[PDB]
Design a protein around this ligand. Structure first.
Ligand SMILES: Cc1cc2nc3c(=O)[nH]c(=O)nc-3n(C[C@H](O)[C@H](O)[C@H](O)COP(=O)(O)O)c2cc1C
Ligand code: SF4
Ligand code: SF4
Ligand code: SF4
Ligand code: FES
Ligand code: FES
Ligand SMILES: [Zn+2]
Lengths: 47, 22, 80, 106, 87, 263, 83, 210, 426
């Protein structure tokens, strides 16, 4: 890498990390899609 | 020498001759 | 506009629960016979499969496009 | 290079995955661009065929060099768009070099 | 486009007729694919007889059974299509 | 009486006098590759992708527009009628913008398939392509019209099935663009059908822009409840939420069309 | 929070997942990163965005920059070009 | 081919046939079969151009109403044919024929002459809007190959200089002897009649009985 | 053979020299037996046409008699009509501009003589809008004729009633096409129709109609007057009569002169018109029928004669018989290239093969003139050319392919060198 450095693209990380699995930095999978069926919230004003 | 309306106006003049419409 | 997928009869089991999965949000199904669609060449044979396997059936008659008369001349009709 | 994620959600990476691993759902982003709201590669389902690498038209999904990603919990192995995009940012320099070396062949 | 020799489609075709003639009580159809493969079709009762003739006939020795399989055409009244491939 | 006998590859089908060559192939069961011909839309002959070869005839004929005549043999798969398709598909594709992974009529394209089935494997158009400015025709139909194969089925539907008579062709040459000359939205019921009827994905649905891709969509056949015509419709569901409702044909009730409300 | 405003509600329990752990998100968001790139002022009605790098980029497409008001944007890169 | 409404070119520009023009429009309609007024689109649209060279979107709309035809139809005709300006056009509007017949007889020279003579490049118009230069296609009159159509007139068989002369005539004064400014009469053999030298024939000549 | 006599020529007013107005026409005696002819009846007139052997005279030379005859079938309650195309667009054609401008009357009586042959209620003349002045001349002539009562009710003493109208063209070559002239007359966009509903069957305004090149309508009264035989004698076999020949480009005296059809080409330029500029040796190529027809190189020119049968043997079309000549001083690759530019700026775009195909050849042809394209591309254009030739809705795609085919057929070595020239300088 010293001889021919790599291409820098102004998003690539500068601090790369090792396995963070046992440490609390670990990926915890989650759905990234937003809600699908929005619901009718009752009316808060007493009828 | 002819005017911009020569064709149209001449035609209108011919309208009288023009045989009846379908 | 292709009609090669409107040729063979298919019998499809009734659709069932597809609840969202809490961890990843993937669709989850508890019905085994959901994705199964068997293809049968003729209405008579498909009805037979339902009877011997004991599944209830409700056959829908094939509906094919009715003949339609077309002729390029018409579009240039004196009075349409 | 600009910073716009390559994937445009054509979703044929999902179509050709042999194991049904990739799940993609998309919607037009506010910019108006096409983008994937959710991209989930289930690595335990994935059999690392490399067809997704093959299929992508923009070549957004690539088989990265790292093989050492063993995880304590099963959930960590399931990967959403943010882990893969982060994986992409970390290994982009080598991925670019690797694709650079092999693209003439493909 | 694959190279096809009609020598085989002729040899195999003839054999098909030979088998059919020798075992007419069971052979229903005998076809050769465009891929030069013969596929005598026999009534289920002819399982024992047709095989035995092929295993033990000087002009057709078919000693080993490559495979026994059963495609399932649900539409077909007789659902399964036991296929025996011999060498 | 009134039953000519025409042969489609020697099958002696018999058809009422007046049937087109494309129609003759249909009753035998063959399907002429076609663009710009829709059963319930007038024959226009724009694409010429249906050229077939009646036997003993110098030139190939336009299937969708040629009244069949007694005795003719169609030779639909004749070496000639394949050059007559291998060479048309060369042209439609030449000016086409390859954004098939943008075109949400990805698997719902009668132009890739008719290209994957009836056309060539490569391209020779080493020249440059064209681009046509898009149009905000409305809030329902997204017209990315650089996709348009100038097949004039929209201009027909928009005049014949619906009485809008707004959409029209503008100009001549390779920059004939089929969009409203002045930007007036295509506001009418029956509007969304243009999506379903444009085989190209030039103008498609804006709400269902990029939410799905057709192979995934599980298709369940059901009934329109928004209006009392009870139009037949197919609800396309993916992973359990409805993604699109598009029409399914019922001769008597909705013959391939559905309202702007119920889709 | 995430690219798509994916933020578990204050009461959702998947937030337990993030308990004692990092919810993985990326600071670099595309919607913004493309904006930074300036509009390319080309001098031809129709220009092509091969995607940068030819075969190493995206399928080639031609954009019509004729509309004087707006700017053409490649359905792929998002790069914008104006005449 | 898109009309992006502009303050100048948009319906705010009101259009209406002068009373006289409307009379003309009526005759035009009479020629065609009754119940087929729509057929008079081209003729009427032209009359509009005669009235206003610009032929603005408003004009197109008027044509439609006058002929009770869908507005789009008028647009299609206007955007299809080429003799319709659809924009403002120069008082003189010269058009230079550049098909192979003319080019083979050096049409390109004429165009170049005009470009600098006019000082304006083709596809563009002079500042005074007096002259608009357009590279039009075969205008007929090919025999007199070097040829250009200034407005309605057909100036033919012109050598580069001749045009400059014509343009000057147009620039100061009017009616610059429109026609082939050469020795030949129409499309005759330039040197001498190769035929038709003798007097014409007479009525009844070599007529078969009845 | 050739060498028609001026006496046996048809448009004596050609080149003017005689009042194009009626008076000059009366000395010409053009309106001499018009009442009698119409009195003869539709059939007799059409018959004379057949005897004449007169072919199209316009673009494709279909037998005129048979064609006109197709509408001699009984009326089905729709008024039959006459359409006389005077678009005269084919590059190189000033042939028609003459009859219209110089001898308007000949065409006026051509119209009524032709009209009773088809029993047309009325005739519409579509003169190209470009020719505004030309229009001025004909309706002055048409106005004279009715004033006389030659046309209109009681036409020339005949109970026949025929009305003649002039329609403004709007700068379109395609308007010229038979199905498209109609649509322009109908007021829609000028886009041809398919032939299956033939023009006679579906007419303009759904009323049977027929379309003739103005030359074809103009000669019918004189041919009836002179009889089919006199006319049929001048031509060679099937090809008959004398067709006007317009020679333009690389000839000493470019002019339109009518000569016996079947006149040798080397001779046409040699006897009328004028010598090939720079000597007959300076003849790279000539396009006999105008831009649509393929050009023929000099070897053939010395031998080939201008008649449709001889030309089709030669692989070229008599067409409008517009002779365009190219000296050895011209870049043919660029000459034909502008004709493809002539067709991209003009085809309607209704049909897929012409729309993209003609634009595709234009792009390749421009590269060919530069020499940027490689030698292998040259035979591709050939293949692109025949895809367009048999697949188009109208003939213009037919027409665009032929010049491309001619350039590859006889000038393939020159294009290869232009290929080579650019490759060498890199
Ligand atoms: C693109 C195109 C342009 C044409 N232009 C003309 C024209 O300018 N004049 C003409 O007489 N015929 C023209 N034709 C031929 C006509 O369509 C038609 O065949 C002819 O006018 C019939 O006349 P005829 O019977 O006298 O030959 C053209 C055809 C095509 C395909
Ligand atoms: S990854 Fe490549 S293929 Fe899968 S969607 Fe994003 S872009 Fe299309
Ligand atoms: S239409 Fe959309 S999908 Fe069909 S080809 Fe053109 S781009 Fe690819
Ligand atoms: S929009 Fe769809 S339908 Fe209308 S023309 Fe273009 S392609 Fe044919
Ligand atoms: S379907 Fe035959 S013309 Fe388009
Ligand atoms: S080409 Fe210029 S006159 Fe026909
Ligand atoms: Zn881009």
């Amino acid at each position: 890498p010293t001889t021919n450095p790599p291409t820098a693209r102004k998003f690539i990380w500068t601090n790369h990390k090792f396995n963070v699995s046992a440490t609390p930095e670990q990926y915890v999978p989650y759905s990234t899609t937003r809600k699908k069926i929005h619901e009718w919230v009752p009316p808060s004003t007493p009828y | 020498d002819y005017n911009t309306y020569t064709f149209l106006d001449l035609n209108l003049d011919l309208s009288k001759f023009r045989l009846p419409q379908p | 506009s292709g009609v090669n997928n409107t040729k063979k009869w298919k019998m499809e089991f009734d659709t069932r629960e597809r609840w969202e999965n809490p961890l990843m949000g993937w669709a989850s199904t508890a019905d085994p016979l959901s994705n199964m669609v068997l293809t049968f060449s003729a209405k008579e044979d498909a009805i037979a499969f339902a009877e011997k396997n004991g599944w209830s059936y409700d056959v829908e008659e094939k509906k094919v496009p009715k003949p339609k008369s077309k002729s390029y001349g018409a579009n240039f009709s004196w009075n349409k | 290079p600009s910073g716009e994620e390559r994937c445009i959600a054509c979703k044929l990476c999902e179509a050709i995955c042999p194991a049904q691993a990739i799940t993609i759902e998309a919607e037009p982003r506010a910019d108006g661009s096409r983008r994937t709201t959710r991209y989930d590669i289930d690595m335990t389902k994935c059999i690392y065929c490399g067809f997704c690498q093959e299929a992508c038209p923009v070549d957004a999904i690539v088989e990265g060099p790292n093989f050492e990603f063993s995880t304590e919990t099963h959930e960590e192995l399931l990967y959403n768009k943010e882990k893969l995009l982060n994986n992409g940012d970390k290994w982009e320099a080598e991925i670019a070099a690797n694709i650079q070396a092999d693209y003439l062949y493909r | 486009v694959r190279p096809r020799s009609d020598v085989t489609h002729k040899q195999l075709s003839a054999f098909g007729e030979y088998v059919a003639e020798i075992l007419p009580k069971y052979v229903q159809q005998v076809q050769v694919s465009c891929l030069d493969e013969l596929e005598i079709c026999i009534h289920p009762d002819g399982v024992i007889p047709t095989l035995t003739f092929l295993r033990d006939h000087t002009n057709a020795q078919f000693k080993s059974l490559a495979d026994l399989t059963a495609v399932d055409v649900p539409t077909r009244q007789n659902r399964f299509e036991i296929v025996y491939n011999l060498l | 009486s009134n039953l000519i006998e025409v042969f489609v590859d020697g099958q002696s089908v018999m058809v009422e006098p007046g049937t087109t060559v494309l129609q003759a192939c249909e009753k035998v069961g063959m399907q002429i590759p076609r663009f710009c011909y829709h059963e319930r839309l007038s024959v226009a002959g724009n694409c010429r992708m249906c050229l077939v070869e009646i036997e003993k005839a110098p030139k190939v004929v336009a299937a969708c527009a040629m009244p069949v005549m007694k005795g003719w043999n169609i030779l639909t798969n004749s070496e000639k009628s394949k050059k007559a398709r291998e060479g048309v598909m060369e042209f439609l594709l030449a000016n086409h913008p390859l954004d098939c992974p943008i075109c949400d009529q990805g698997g719902e394209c009668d132009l890739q398939d008719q290209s994957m089935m009836f056309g060539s494997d490569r391209s020779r158009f080493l020249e440059g392509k064209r681009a046509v400015e898009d149009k905000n025709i409305g809030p329902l139909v997204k017209t990315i019209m650089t996709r348009c194969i100038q097949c004039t089925r929209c201009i027909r539907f928009a005049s014949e099935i619906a009485g809008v008579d707004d959409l029209g062709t503008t100009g001549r040459g390779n920059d004939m663009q089929v969009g409203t000359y002045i930007e007036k939205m295509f506001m009418s019921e029956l509007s969304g059908n243009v999506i379903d009827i444009c085989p190209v994905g030039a103008l498609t649905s804006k709400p269902y822009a990029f939410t799905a891709r057709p192979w995934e969509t599980r298709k369940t056949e059901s009934i329109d409840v928004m209006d009392a015509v009870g139009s037949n419709i197919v609800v396309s569901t993916r992973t359990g939420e409805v993604m699109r409702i598009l029409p399914r044909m019922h001769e008597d009730i909705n013959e391939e069309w559905i309202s702007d409300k119920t889709r | 929070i995430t690219h798509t405003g994916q933020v578990y509600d204050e009461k959702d329990y998947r937030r337990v997942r993030f308990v004692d752990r990092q919810k993985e998100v990326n600071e670099n968001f595309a919607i913004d990163l493309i904006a930074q790139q300036p509009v390319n002022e080309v001098e031809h009605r129709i220009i092509a965005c091969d995607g940068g790098g030819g075969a190493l980029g995206h399928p080639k497409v031609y954009i019509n920059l004729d509309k004087e008001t707006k700017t053409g944007t490649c359905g792929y890169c998002g790069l914008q070009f104006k005449q | 081919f898109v009309h992006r409404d502009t303050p100048e070119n948009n319906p705010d520009t009101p259009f209406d046939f002068t009373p006289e023009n409307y009379k003309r429009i009526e005759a035009i309609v009479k020629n065609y079969p009754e119940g087929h007024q729509a057929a008079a689109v081209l003729p009427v649209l032209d009359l509009a151009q005669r009235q206003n060279g610009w032929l603005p979107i408003s004009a197109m709309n008027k044509v439609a109403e006058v002929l009770q035809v869908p507005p789009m139809r008028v647009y299609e005709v206007a955007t299809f044919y080429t003799m319709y300006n659809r924009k403002p056009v120069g008082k003189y509007h010269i058009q230079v024929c550049t098909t192979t017949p003319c080019m083979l007889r050096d049409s390109d020279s004429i165009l170049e002459t005009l470009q600098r003579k006019l000082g304006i490049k083709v596809g563009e118009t002079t500042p005074d809007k007096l002259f608009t230069l357009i590279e039009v296609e075969c205008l007929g009159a090919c025999v007199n190959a070097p040829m250009v159509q200034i407005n309605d007139n057909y100036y033919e068989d012109l050598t580069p200089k001749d045009i400059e002369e014509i343009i000057d005539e147009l620039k100061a004064g009017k009616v610059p002897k429109p026609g082939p400014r050469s020795g030949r009469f129409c499309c005759e053999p330039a040197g001498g009649l190769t035929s038709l030298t003798e007097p014409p024939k007479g009525p009844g000549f070599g007529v078969q009985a009845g | 053979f050739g060498s028609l006599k001026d006496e046996d020529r048809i448009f004596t007013n050609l080149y003017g020299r005689h009042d194009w107005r009626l008076k000059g026409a009366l000395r010409r005696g053009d309106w001499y037996k018009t009442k009698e002819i119409l009195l003869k009846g539709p059939d007799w007139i059409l018959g004379e046409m057949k005897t004449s052997g007169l072919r199209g005279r316009g673009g494709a030379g279909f037998p005129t008699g048979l064609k006109w005859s197709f509408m001699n079938k009984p009326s089905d309650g729709r008024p039959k009509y006459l359409v006389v195309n005077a678009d005269e667009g084919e590059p190189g054609t000033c042939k028609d501009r003459e009859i219209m401008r110089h001898d308007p009357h000949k065409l006026v009586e051509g119209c009524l003589v032709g009209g009773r042959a088809m029993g047309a209620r009325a005739a519409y003349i579509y003169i190209r809008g470009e020719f505004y002045n030309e229009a001025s001349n004909l309706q002055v002539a048409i106005r004279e004729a009715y004033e006389a009562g030659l046309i209109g009710k009681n036409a020339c003493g005949s109970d026949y009633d025929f009305d003649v109208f002039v329609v403004r063209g709007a700068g379109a070559y395609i308007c010229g096409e038979e199905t498209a002239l109609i649509e322009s007359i109908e007021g829609k966009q000028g886009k041809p129709r398919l032939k299956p509903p033939f023009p006679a069957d579906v007419g303009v305004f759904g009323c049977p109609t027929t379309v003739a090149n103005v030359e074809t309508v103009a000669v019918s009264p004189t041919i009836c007057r002179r009889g089919g035989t006199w006319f049929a004698g001048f031509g060679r076999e099937r090809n008959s009569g004398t067709k006007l020949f317009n020679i333009s480009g690389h000839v000493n005296h470019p002019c339109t002169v009518e000569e016996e059809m079947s006149v040798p080409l080397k001779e046409l330029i040699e006897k009328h018109a004028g010598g090939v500029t720079g000597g007959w040796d300076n003849l790279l190529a000539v396009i006999p029928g105008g831009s649509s027809t393929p050009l023929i190189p000099k070897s053939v020119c010395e031998t080939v004669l201008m008649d449709f049968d001889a030309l089709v043997q030669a692989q070229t079309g008599l067409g409008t018989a517009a002779v365009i000549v190219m000296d050895r001083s011209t870049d043919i690759v660029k000459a034909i290239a502008r004709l493809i530019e002539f067709y991209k700026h003009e085809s309607c775009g209704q049909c897929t093969p012409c729309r993209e195909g003609v634009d595709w050849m234009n792009k390749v042809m421009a590269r060919f003139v530069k020499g940027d394209a490689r030698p292998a591309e040259i035979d591709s254009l050939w293949e692109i050319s025949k895809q367009i030739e048999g697949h188009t809705i109208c003939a213009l795609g037919d027409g665009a392919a032929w010049p491309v085919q001619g350039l590859i057929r006889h000038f393939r070595p020159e294009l290869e060198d232009r290929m080579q020239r650019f490759a060498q300088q890199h």
